[PDB]
Amino acid sequence: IISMNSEFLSEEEVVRVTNEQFVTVRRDELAGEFDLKLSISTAEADNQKAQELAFMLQTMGNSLPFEMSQMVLSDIARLRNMPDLAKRIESYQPQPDPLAQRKAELEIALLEAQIAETQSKAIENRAS
Amino acid sequence: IISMNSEFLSEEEVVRVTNEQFVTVRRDELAGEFDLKLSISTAEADNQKAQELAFMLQTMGNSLPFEMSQMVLSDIARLRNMPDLAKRIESYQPQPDPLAQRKAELEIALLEAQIAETQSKAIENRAS
Amino acid sequence: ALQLKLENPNAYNSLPDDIIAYEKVIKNQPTVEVVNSQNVVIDPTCNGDISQAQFVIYSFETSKSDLEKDGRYKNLDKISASMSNPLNTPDHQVEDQSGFNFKDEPRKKFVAYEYWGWWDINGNGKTVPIVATFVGNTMIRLEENPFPDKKIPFVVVPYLPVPRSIYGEPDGALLEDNQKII
Amino acid sequence: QFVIYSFETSKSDLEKDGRYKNLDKISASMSNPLNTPDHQVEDQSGFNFKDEPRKKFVAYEYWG
């Protein structure tokens, strides 16, 4: 069915089902023979997949960047038949606070100001 | 029933039941064939759905923005036959405190003031 | 609204045509059906390997309107559906018993045949996969495999495997004497 | 020292492989599936194709 669905189904029909960008398969090759692995979806298989995803999420913790945590959380939400919550966790792009960056820059400027002031104080001490 | 309800039911009747914005289906296509998944609602299924939603809510924690926590909490409230509490959790839009933003801006201004004061002190030390 | 077109095609297609700015495909879907083992003749020589099956012949029951709707059938006028009769061929096993048949021509049920096997069509020794459909003595379809995999669309799963064989063995092959004694 | 395998094949398979010589003097007649008392064909009925490019005959491999 997968091999026949890459030749008899147009893009306007696959996008109608998936509502995402249509991935294209090569021309003179079978579809899903190399980069796909189809099996039977059982409840126990889904439970084990969710338990492994949660274990991975625990394992990464805060060491790895939060982008991969987004992927894991989106996969967990999509596997549990909650697709809308997954599309959010995916679409969420975190943005830095401009005020915090401004504060850091001002702190660096102030530190260099104190260094210059101390150097000037030493020069004044020598002159005195 | 779903397919027949998208052609024989007017908007004034669907809105009368759902009291929300009426979603419209395409014209020359079946309703709910692609983007719907209908099943049997059992008590155990609802319990598992609630337990998975709570697990997801625990998993996100404070790392993800609170907007998705709103979606999860609203889904939990709506699934447990408490729709009014869900419509609140959804309608709640958090607003920043103007006083906190003002305090942050004044702190940045004060930091730049200290940097300028230190630079002036160094200049005065050189002159001395 | 363009961003809606790239991000949400489902909502974009629901917009009015003004805001957005022949042969219709009525049906397009795979067909999976478990067939009667009496109406399938798998190559006797395929030594327990549907992959190396030289030919598989399926004898299904169809009407003239179905062939007309498919459109890829020729020589439809010389079919007649008479002789070719459901309760008329001693090979096809119709699960009807009573022998009901439609009086109108566009719905009369007759027996067809599909030949999903290999053949030497180019006259050079080597065999290629072909598809042949014939009713009675006339051939209505003849072409190469339209599927991308170029393989016979018949999945045979044995229950109790028999080595070097394609057919299986039910649990009842070991309980005849036990059932009789009980 | 030697292992001999007696498989059943057709002429089109040998032509497709391409690494076989003296294919014209094979005839597939005698060499018949239900024709050699050594090879055990799991066919019983003795079905065989009428067309030449698909006739099944018995071959031999000497891997030694």
Short mmCIF file of C-alpha atoms in Angstrom, two decimals:
data_model
loop_
_atom_site.label_atom_id
_atom_site.label_comp_id
_atom_site.label_asym_id
_atom_site.label_seq_id
_atom_site.Cartn_x
_atom_site.Cartn_y
_atom_site.Cartn_z
CA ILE A 1 0.00 0.00 0.00
CA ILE A 2 2.84 2.40 0.86
CA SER A 3 4.62 1.73 -2.44
CA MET A 4 1.41 2.26 -4.42
CA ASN A 5 0.56 5.43 -2.46
CA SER A 6 3.70 7.23 -3.68
CA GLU A 7 2.68 6.95 -7.34
CA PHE A 8 -1.15 6.99 -7.52
CA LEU A 9 -1.65 9.70 -4.86
CA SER A 10 -1.10 13.33 -5.81
CA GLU A 11 0.32 15.94 -3.46
CA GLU A 12 -3.07 17.64 -3.08
CA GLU A 13 -4.40 14.39 -1.56
CA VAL A 14 -1.53 13.60 0.82
CA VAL A 15 -1.49 17.19 2.10
CA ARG A 16 -5.27 16.98 2.53
CA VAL A 17 -4.74 14.13 5.00
CA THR A 18 -1.56 15.23 6.79
CA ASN A 19 -1.98 19.05 6.55
CA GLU A 20 1.81 19.41 6.36
CA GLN A 21 4.51 19.86 3.75
CA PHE A 22 4.46 17.04 1.21
CA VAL A 23 7.66 14.98 1.34
CA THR A 24 8.72 13.76 -2.10
CA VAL A 25 10.25 10.34 -2.85
CA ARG A 26 12.95 9.80 -5.51
CA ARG A 27 11.83 8.92 -9.04
CA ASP A 28 13.28 5.56 -10.06
CA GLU A 29 13.19 3.81 -6.70
CA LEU A 30 10.74 2.08 -4.39
CA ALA A 31 9.12 4.18 -1.67
CA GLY A 32 9.78 3.23 1.94
CA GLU A 33 12.10 0.33 1.16
CA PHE A 34 15.16 2.06 2.65
CA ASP A 35 14.10 4.84 5.03
CA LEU A 36 10.89 3.33 6.47
CA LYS A 37 10.11 0.57 9.00
CA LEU A 38 6.46 -0.48 9.12
CA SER A 39 5.10 -2.71 11.89
CA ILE A 40 1.90 -3.41 13.84
CA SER A 41 0.71 -0.75 16.29
CA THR A 42 -0.37 -2.40 19.54
CA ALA A 43 -1.32 -0.77 22.83
CA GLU A 44 1.65 -2.34 24.62
CA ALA A 45 4.01 -1.10 21.89
CA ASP A 46 2.68 2.45 22.32
CA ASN A 47 3.01 2.19 26.11
CA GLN A 48 6.63 1.04 25.79
CA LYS A 49 7.37 3.82 23.29
CA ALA A 50 5.93 6.41 25.69
CA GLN A 51 7.87 4.94 28.63
CA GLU A 52 11.11 5.05 26.63
CA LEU A 53 10.44 8.63 25.50
CA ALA A 54 9.84 9.67 29.12
CA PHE A 55 13.03 7.89 30.18
CA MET A 56 14.98 9.76 27.50
CA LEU A 57 13.42 13.05 28.59
CA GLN A 58 14.51 12.35 32.16
CA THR A 59 17.99 11.36 30.95
CA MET A 60 18.70 14.57 29.02
CA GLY A 61 17.54 16.79 31.87
CA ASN A 62 18.89 20.33 31.70
CA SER A 63 22.28 19.33 30.25
CA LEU A 64 21.10 19.31 26.63
CA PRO A 65 19.41 22.30 24.94
CA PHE A 66 15.66 22.62 25.37
CA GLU A 67 15.09 22.20 21.61
CA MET A 68 15.50 18.42 21.87
CA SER A 69 13.22 18.41 24.91
CA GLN A 70 10.69 20.07 22.59
CA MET A 71 11.05 17.18 20.14
CA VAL A 72 10.61 14.59 22.89
CA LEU A 73 7.57 16.36 24.37
CA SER A 74 6.00 16.78 20.93
CA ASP A 75 6.54 13.08 20.19
CA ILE A 76 4.95 12.15 23.53
CA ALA A 77 1.94 14.39 22.86
CA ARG A 78 1.52 13.14 19.28
CA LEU A 79 1.78 9.49 20.32
CA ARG A 80 -0.94 9.91 22.96
CA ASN A 81 -3.49 11.14 20.36
CA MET A 82 -3.06 14.82 21.32
CA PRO A 83 -1.80 16.33 18.05
CA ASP A 84 -2.77 19.95 18.70
CA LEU A 85 -0.70 20.11 21.88
CA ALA A 86 2.24 18.69 19.94
CA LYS A 87 1.98 21.26 17.14
CA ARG A 88 2.16 23.96 19.86
CA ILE A 89 5.21 22.50 21.70
CA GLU A 90 6.76 22.41 18.22
CA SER A 91 5.76 25.90 17.07
CA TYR A 92 6.96 27.46 20.33
CA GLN A 93 10.21 29.33 19.72
CA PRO A 94 11.77 30.77 22.90
CA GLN A 95 13.01 34.34 22.73
CA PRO A 96 15.58 35.99 25.02
CA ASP A 97 14.55 38.90 27.19
CA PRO A 98 16.06 42.13 25.80
CA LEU A 99 16.19 43.57 29.32
CA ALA A 100 18.44 40.74 30.55
CA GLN A 101 20.86 41.20 27.65
CA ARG A 102 20.86 44.95 28.29
CA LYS A 103 21.60 44.32 31.97
CA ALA A 104 24.50 42.03 31.08
CA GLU A 105 25.94 44.60 28.67
CA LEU A 106 25.63 47.37 31.26
CA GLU A 107 27.30 45.12 33.85
CA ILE A 108 30.24 44.54 31.50
CA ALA A 109 30.48 48.28 30.80
CA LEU A 110 30.38 49.02 34.54
CA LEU A 111 33.12 46.46 35.20
CA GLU A 112 35.38 48.10 32.62
CA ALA A 113 34.51 51.46 34.19
CA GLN A 114 35.66 50.22 37.61
CA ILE A 115 38.88 48.89 36.07
CA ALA A 116 39.56 52.28 34.49
CA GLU A 117 38.71 54.07 37.75
CA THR A 118 41.12 51.86 39.71
CA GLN A 119 43.88 52.51 37.17
CA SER A 120 43.27 56.26 37.44
CA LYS A 121 43.32 56.00 41.24
CA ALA A 122 46.70 54.26 41.11
CA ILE A 123 48.04 56.97 38.79
CA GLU A 124 46.77 59.66 41.17
CA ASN A 125 48.42 57.86 44.09
CA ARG A 126 51.75 57.86 42.26
CA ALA A 127 51.37 61.58 41.50
CA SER A 128 50.53 62.29 45.15
CA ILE B 1 -24.09 10.65 11.11
CA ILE B 2 -21.06 12.98 11.05
CA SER B 3 -21.02 13.08 7.24
CA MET B 4 -24.75 13.83 7.10
CA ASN B 5 -24.47 16.48 9.84
CA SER B 6 -22.15 18.67 7.72
CA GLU B 7 -24.75 19.08 4.95
CA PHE B 8 -28.22 18.95 6.55
CA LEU B 9 -27.33 21.03 9.64
CA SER B 10 -27.11 24.80 9.31
CA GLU B 11 -24.65 26.96 11.23
CA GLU B 12 -27.42 28.35 13.46
CA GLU B 13 -28.05 24.80 14.71
CA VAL B 14 -24.45 23.70 15.31
CA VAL B 15 -23.67 26.95 17.13
CA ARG B 16 -26.84 26.46 19.18
CA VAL B 17 -25.36 23.19 20.49
CA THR B 18 -21.67 24.08 20.82
CA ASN B 19 -21.98 27.84 21.58
CA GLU B 20 -18.69 28.43 19.77
CA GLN B 21 -17.46 29.55 16.36
CA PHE B 22 -18.79 27.30 13.61
CA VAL B 23 -15.99 25.44 11.85
CA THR B 24 -16.67 25.00 8.13
CA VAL B 25 -15.81 21.89 6.08
CA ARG B 26 -14.65 22.05 2.44
CA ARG B 27 -17.30 21.85 -0.29
CA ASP B 28 -16.63 18.85 -2.53
CA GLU B 29 -15.26 16.45 0.07
CA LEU B 30 -16.46 14.16 2.83
CA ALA B 31 -16.56 15.56 6.36
CA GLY B 32 -14.37 13.94 8.99
CA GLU B 33 -12.79 11.39 6.66
CA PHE B 34 -9.31 12.94 6.91
CA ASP B 35 -9.04 15.12 10.02
CA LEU B 36 -11.30 13.18 12.43
CA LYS B 37 -10.96 9.93 14.41
CA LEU B 38 -14.20 8.68 15.96
CA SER B 39 -14.24 5.87 18.52
CA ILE B 40 -16.23 4.61 21.53
CA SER B 41 -16.05 6.65 24.74
CA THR B 42 -15.59 4.32 27.71
CA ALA B 43 -14.86 5.19 31.33
CA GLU B 44 -11.47 3.46 31.19
CA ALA B 45 -10.57 5.35 28.02
CA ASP B 46 -11.39 8.66 29.72
CA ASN B 47 -9.38 7.66 32.79
CA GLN B 48 -6.37 6.79 30.63
CA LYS B 49 -6.72 10.06 28.70
CA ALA B 50 -6.78 12.03 31.96
CA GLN B 51 -3.79 10.10 33.32
CA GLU B 52 -1.82 10.79 30.13
CA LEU B 53 -2.77 14.48 30.20
CA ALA B 54 -1.60 14.73 33.81
CA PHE B 55 1.65 12.95 32.92
CA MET B 56 2.23 15.42 30.09
CA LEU B 57 1.49 18.34 32.42
CA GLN B 58 4.07 16.99 34.87
CA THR B 59 6.56 16.45 32.04
CA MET B 60 6.45 20.02 30.69
CA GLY B 61 6.83 21.55 34.15
CA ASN B 62 8.11 25.12 34.11
CA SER B 63 10.41 24.62 31.10
CA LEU B 64 7.71 25.27 28.50
CA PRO B 65 5.58 28.44 28.42
CA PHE B 66 2.45 28.46 30.57
CA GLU B 67 0.21 28.79 27.49
CA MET B 68 0.52 25.06 26.75
CA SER B 69 -0.11 24.32 30.42
CA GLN B 70 -3.34 26.26 29.91
CA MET B 71 -4.28 23.96 27.03
CA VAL B 72 -3.53 20.85 29.08
CA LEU B 73 -5.48 22.11 32.11
CA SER B 74 -8.43 23.13 29.93
CA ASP B 75 -8.45 19.70 28.29
CA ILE B 76 -8.38 18.02 31.71
CA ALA B 77 -11.26 20.19 32.96
CA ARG B 78 -13.32 19.67 29.80
CA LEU B 79 -12.78 15.90 29.83
CA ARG B 80 -13.97 15.63 33.45
CA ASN B 81 -17.37 17.22 32.62
CA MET B 82 -16.38 20.65 34.00
CA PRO B 83 -16.69 22.86 30.91
CA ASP B 84 -17.09 26.21 32.65
CA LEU B 85 -13.78 25.84 34.50
CA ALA B 86 -12.13 25.00 31.18
CA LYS B 87 -13.53 28.07 29.40
CA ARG B 88 -11.99 30.16 32.23
CA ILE B 89 -8.51 28.53 32.13
CA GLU B 90 -8.73 29.23 28.39
CA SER B 91 -9.98 32.82 28.57
CA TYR B 92 -7.35 33.75 31.17
CA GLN B 93 -4.66 35.88 29.53
CA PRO B 94 -1.76 36.73 31.88
CA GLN B 95 -0.57 40.32 31.89
CA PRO B 96 2.84 41.60 33.04
CA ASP B 97 3.04 43.95 35.99
CA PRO B 98 3.90 47.48 34.76
CA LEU B 99 5.69 48.18 38.04
CA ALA B 100 8.12 45.29 37.50
CA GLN B 101 8.97 46.45 33.98
CA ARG B 102 9.43 49.99 35.30
CA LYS B 103 11.74 48.67 38.02
CA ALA B 104 13.81 46.76 35.46
CA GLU B 105 14.10 49.84 33.24
CA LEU B 106 15.13 52.01 36.20
CA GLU B 107 17.69 49.38 37.21
CA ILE B 108 19.21 49.44 33.72
CA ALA B 109 19.28 53.25 33.77
CA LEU B 110 20.93 53.22 37.20
CA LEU B 111 23.54 50.72 36.00
CA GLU B 112 24.45 52.97 33.07
CA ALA B 113 24.55 55.90 35.52
CA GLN B 114 27.08 54.05 37.70
CA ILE B 115 29.17 53.23 34.62
CA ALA B 116 29.21 56.91 33.64
CA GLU B 117 30.03 57.95 37.22
CA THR B 118 32.96 55.52 37.36
CA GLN B 119 34.28 56.82 34.04
CA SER B 120 34.03 60.40 35.32
CA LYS B 121 35.80 59.38 38.53
CA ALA B 122 38.67 57.88 36.52
CA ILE B 123 38.92 61.08 34.46
CA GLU B 124 39.00 63.16 37.65
CA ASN B 125 41.72 60.89 39.06
CA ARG B 126 43.84 61.45 35.95
CA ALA B 127 43.33 65.22 36.23
CA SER B 128 44.28 65.12 39.92
CA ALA C 1 -3.55 35.02 4.08
CA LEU C 2 -0.55 33.65 2.19
CA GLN C 3 1.03 32.48 5.45
CA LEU C 4 -2.20 30.56 6.01
CA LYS C 5 -1.57 28.94 2.62
CA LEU C 6 1.92 27.75 3.53
CA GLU C 7 1.13 26.78 7.15
CA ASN C 8 -2.53 25.67 7.19
CA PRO C 9 -3.60 24.25 3.81
CA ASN C 10 -6.81 22.87 5.31
CA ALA C 11 -7.96 26.33 6.41
CA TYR C 12 -6.57 27.96 3.26
CA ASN C 13 -8.66 25.74 0.98
CA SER C 14 -11.76 26.72 2.99
CA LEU C 15 -11.33 30.38 2.00
CA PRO C 16 -13.55 31.84 -0.74
CA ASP C 17 -12.13 31.47 -4.23
CA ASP C 18 -11.88 35.25 -4.65
CA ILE C 19 -9.68 35.49 -1.55
CA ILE C 20 -7.60 32.59 -2.89
CA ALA C 21 -6.95 34.50 -6.12
CA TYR C 22 -12.34 18.25 -16.99
CA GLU C 23 -11.94 14.68 -15.70
CA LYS C 24 -12.75 14.35 -12.00
CA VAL C 25 -11.22 11.60 -9.86
CA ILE C 26 -14.34 10.17 -8.22
CA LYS C 27 -12.59 7.28 -6.46
CA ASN C 28 -8.89 6.69 -5.77
CA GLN C 29 -8.06 4.24 -2.98
CA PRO C 30 -6.32 0.89 -2.41
CA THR C 31 -8.42 -2.27 -2.44
CA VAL C 32 -7.51 -5.05 0.00
CA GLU C 33 -9.71 -8.15 0.16
CA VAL C 34 -9.14 -11.71 1.35
CA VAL C 35 -10.03 -14.02 -1.52
CA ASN C 36 -11.38 -17.55 -1.67
CA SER C 37 -8.55 -20.07 -1.94
CA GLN C 38 -10.56 -22.00 -4.54
CA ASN C 39 -10.42 -19.11 -7.05
CA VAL C 40 -6.61 -18.72 -6.87
CA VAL C 41 -4.22 -20.97 -8.81
CA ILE C 42 -0.63 -20.32 -7.61
CA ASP C 43 2.30 -21.80 -9.63
CA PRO C 44 2.77 -25.43 -8.56
CA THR C 45 6.55 -24.99 -9.02
CA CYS C 46 6.95 -21.95 -6.70
CA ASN C 47 8.69 -24.04 -4.02
CA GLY C 48 7.13 -22.29 -0.99
CA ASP C 49 8.15 -18.76 -2.06
CA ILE C 50 5.42 -16.51 -3.41
CA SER C 51 8.29 -14.30 -4.62
CA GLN C 52 9.43 -16.89 -7.20
CA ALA C 53 5.88 -17.68 -8.35
CA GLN C 54 5.84 -17.75 -12.15
CA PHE C 55 2.07 -17.21 -12.39
CA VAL C 56 -0.95 -16.62 -10.17
CA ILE C 57 -4.43 -16.82 -11.71
CA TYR C 58 -7.38 -15.21 -9.92
CA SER C 59 -10.95 -15.90 -11.07
CA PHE C 60 -13.11 -13.08 -9.71
CA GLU C 61 -16.75 -12.25 -10.47
CA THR C 62 -17.49 -8.84 -11.98
CA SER C 63 -20.04 -6.93 -14.04
CA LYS C 64 -19.79 -4.90 -17.23
CA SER C 65 -20.40 -1.55 -15.52
CA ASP C 66 -17.39 -2.11 -13.26
CA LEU C 67 -15.16 -2.71 -16.29
CA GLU C 68 -16.60 0.37 -18.01
CA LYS C 69 -15.95 2.47 -14.90
CA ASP C 70 -12.35 1.23 -14.68
CA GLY C 71 -11.85 2.31 -18.30
CA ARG C 72 -8.63 0.34 -18.91
CA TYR C 73 -10.47 -2.63 -20.48
CA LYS C 74 -10.76 -3.27 -24.21
CA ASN C 75 -12.90 -5.62 -26.32
CA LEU C 76 -15.83 -5.10 -23.97
CA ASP C 77 -18.44 -5.55 -26.72
CA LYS C 78 -17.43 -9.16 -27.49
CA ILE C 79 -17.82 -10.27 -23.81
CA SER C 80 -21.63 -10.87 -23.91
CA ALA C 81 -21.58 -12.15 -20.27
CA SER C 82 -23.37 -15.11 -21.94
CA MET C 83 -21.80 -17.74 -21.75
CA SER C 84 -19.41 -16.57 -18.94
CA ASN C 85 -22.00 -17.08 -16.17
CA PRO C 86 -21.40 -17.03 -12.38
CA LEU C 87 -23.37 -20.22 -11.69
CA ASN C 88 -21.99 -21.18 -15.09
CA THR C 89 -18.38 -22.03 -14.63
CA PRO C 90 -17.36 -25.28 -12.86
CA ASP C 91 -14.09 -23.62 -11.74
CA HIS C 92 -15.18 -20.40 -10.03
CA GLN C 93 -16.95 -21.05 -6.71
CA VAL C 94 -19.72 -18.48 -6.29
CA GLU C 95 -20.90 -18.01 -2.70
CA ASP C 96 -24.48 -17.42 -3.83
CA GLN C 97 -25.92 -20.95 -4.16
CA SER C 98 -29.37 -19.71 -5.20
CA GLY C 99 -27.92 -18.40 -8.47
CA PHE C 100 -29.28 -14.86 -8.41
CA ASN C 101 -28.39 -12.65 -11.36
CA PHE C 102 -29.44 -9.23 -12.61
CA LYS C 103 -31.72 -8.92 -15.62
CA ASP C 104 -30.35 -5.58 -16.81
CA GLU C 105 -27.22 -5.71 -18.96
CA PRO C 106 -25.13 -3.05 -17.12
CA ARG C 107 -25.32 -5.07 -13.88
CA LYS C 108 -25.12 -8.72 -14.99
CA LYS C 109 -22.48 -10.68 -13.09
CA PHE C 110 -20.08 -12.83 -15.12
CA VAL C 111 -16.83 -14.62 -14.29
CA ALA C 112 -13.49 -13.09 -15.31
CA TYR C 113 -9.86 -14.17 -14.95
CA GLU C 114 -6.66 -12.36 -13.97
CA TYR C 115 -3.20 -13.66 -14.90
CA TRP C 116 -0.63 -12.05 -12.60
CA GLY C 117 2.55 -13.69 -13.82
CA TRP C 118 5.76 -13.48 -15.84
CA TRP C 119 5.99 -13.76 -19.61
CA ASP C 120 8.41 -13.23 -22.50
CA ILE C 121 6.75 -10.29 -24.21
CA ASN C 122 9.84 -8.92 -26.00
CA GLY C 123 10.82 -12.14 -27.80
CA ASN C 124 14.36 -12.24 -26.41
CA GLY C 125 14.41 -15.10 -23.89
CA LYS C 126 14.05 -13.04 -20.72
CA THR C 127 10.73 -12.86 -18.88
CA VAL C 128 9.03 -9.70 -17.60
CA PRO C 129 6.02 -9.27 -15.27
CA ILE C 130 2.74 -8.86 -17.15
CA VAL C 131 -0.97 -8.59 -16.36
CA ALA C 132 -3.58 -10.42 -18.42
CA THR C 133 -7.35 -10.27 -17.95
CA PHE C 134 -9.59 -12.44 -20.11
CA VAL C 135 -13.26 -13.45 -20.09
CA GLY C 136 -14.23 -16.68 -21.82
CA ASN C 137 -11.97 -16.74 -24.87
CA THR C 138 -11.39 -12.99 -25.36
CA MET C 139 -8.67 -10.98 -23.62
CA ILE C 140 -9.86 -7.62 -22.28
CA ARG C 141 -6.68 -6.39 -20.58
CA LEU C 142 -3.01 -7.07 -21.31
CA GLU C 143 -0.18 -4.91 -19.98
CA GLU C 144 2.87 -4.92 -17.75
CA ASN C 145 2.61 -4.56 -13.98
CA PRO C 146 1.22 -1.10 -13.10
CA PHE C 147 2.48 -1.35 -9.51
CA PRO C 148 5.86 0.23 -8.70
CA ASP C 149 7.12 -2.95 -7.01
CA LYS C 150 6.41 -5.13 -10.09
CA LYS C 151 5.26 -7.98 -7.85
CA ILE C 152 2.16 -10.17 -7.68
CA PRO C 153 -0.46 -8.60 -5.34
CA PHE C 154 -1.22 -11.78 -3.39
CA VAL C 155 0.00 -12.29 0.18
CA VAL C 156 -0.27 -15.92 1.31
CA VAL C 157 0.23 -16.47 5.04
CA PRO C 158 0.32 -20.10 6.23
CA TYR C 159 -1.11 -20.92 9.64
CA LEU C 160 1.11 -23.91 10.45
CA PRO C 161 4.10 -23.67 8.08
CA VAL C 162 4.95 -26.59 5.81
CA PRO C 163 8.59 -26.52 4.63
CA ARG C 164 9.19 -26.07 0.90
CA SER C 165 5.49 -25.36 0.33
CA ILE C 166 3.23 -22.34 -0.03
CA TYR C 167 0.06 -23.65 1.67
CA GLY C 168 -0.42 -23.96 5.42
CA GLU C 169 -2.12 -26.43 7.73
CA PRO C 170 -5.05 -25.80 10.09
CA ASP C 171 -5.17 -27.05 13.66
CA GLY C 172 -7.80 -29.55 12.51
CA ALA C 173 -5.15 -31.57 10.67
CA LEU C 174 -4.23 -33.14 14.02
CA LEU C 175 -7.66 -33.49 15.68
CA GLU C 176 -9.69 -35.59 13.22
CA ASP C 177 -9.17 -38.84 15.13
CA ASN C 178 -9.57 -37.08 18.48
CA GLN C 179 -12.83 -35.48 17.34
CA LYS C 180 -14.11 -38.82 16.05
CA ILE C 181 -13.24 -40.62 19.30
CA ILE C 182 -14.83 -37.88 21.42
CA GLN D 1 35.65 -31.16 -0.70
CA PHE D 2 32.45 -30.85 -2.75
CA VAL D 3 28.79 -29.96 -2.32
CA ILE D 4 26.38 -30.63 -5.20
CA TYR D 5 23.03 -28.82 -5.33
CA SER D 6 20.35 -29.90 -7.82
CA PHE D 7 17.96 -26.96 -8.20
CA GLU D 8 15.12 -26.47 -10.68
CA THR D 9 15.34 -23.49 -13.02
CA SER D 10 14.11 -22.15 -16.36
CA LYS D 11 15.90 -20.81 -19.42
CA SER D 12 14.76 -17.21 -18.90
CA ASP D 13 16.38 -17.16 -15.46
CA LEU D 14 19.70 -18.27 -16.94
CA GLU D 15 19.38 -15.67 -19.71
CA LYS D 16 18.65 -12.95 -17.15
CA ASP D 17 21.68 -13.96 -15.06
CA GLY D 18 23.83 -13.62 -18.18
CA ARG D 19 26.86 -15.52 -16.84
CA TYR D 20 25.79 -18.83 -18.44
CA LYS D 21 27.20 -20.23 -21.68
CA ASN D 22 26.13 -23.06 -24.00
CA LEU D 23 22.48 -22.20 -23.41
CA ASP D 24 21.40 -23.33 -26.89
CA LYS D 25 22.44 -26.97 -26.37
CA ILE D 26 20.36 -27.32 -23.13
CA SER D 27 16.99 -28.10 -24.84
CA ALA D 28 15.30 -28.60 -21.40
CA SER D 29 14.32 -31.92 -23.07
CA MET D 30 15.49 -34.38 -21.65
CA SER D 31 16.39 -32.55 -18.37
CA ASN D 32 12.79 -32.61 -17.04
CA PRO D 33 11.60 -31.75 -13.50
CA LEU D 34 9.37 -34.82 -13.15
CA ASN D 35 12.09 -36.39 -15.28
CA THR D 36 15.05 -36.96 -13.05
CA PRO D 37 14.97 -39.73 -10.39
CA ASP D 38 17.45 -37.72 -8.27
CA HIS D 39 15.87 -34.28 -7.94
CA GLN D 40 12.76 -34.31 -5.74
CA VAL D 41 10.24 -31.84 -7.16
CA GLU D 42 7.58 -30.70 -4.69
CA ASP D 43 4.95 -30.52 -7.42
CA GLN D 44 3.64 -34.11 -7.66
CA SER D 45 1.11 -33.27 -10.38
CA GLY D 46 3.95 -32.59 -12.81
CA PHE D 47 2.91 -29.18 -14.11
CA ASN D 48 5.17 -27.58 -16.70
CA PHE D 49 4.99 -24.53 -18.95
CA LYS D 50 4.35 -24.96 -22.67
CA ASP D 51 6.30 -21.87 -23.74
CA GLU D 52 10.05 -22.29 -24.16
CA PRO D 53 11.21 -19.22 -22.14
CA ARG D 54 9.45 -20.55 -19.01
CA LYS D 55 9.94 -24.33 -19.15
CA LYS D 56 11.31 -25.74 -15.89
CA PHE D 57 14.26 -28.14 -16.12
CA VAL D 58 16.67 -29.57 -13.56
CA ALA D 59 20.18 -28.14 -13.22
CA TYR D 60 23.18 -28.95 -11.03
CA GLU D 61 25.68 -26.83 -9.09
CA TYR D 62 29.10 -28.14 -8.05
CA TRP D 63 30.43 -25.97 -5.21
CA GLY D 64 33.72 -27.69 -4.48
#
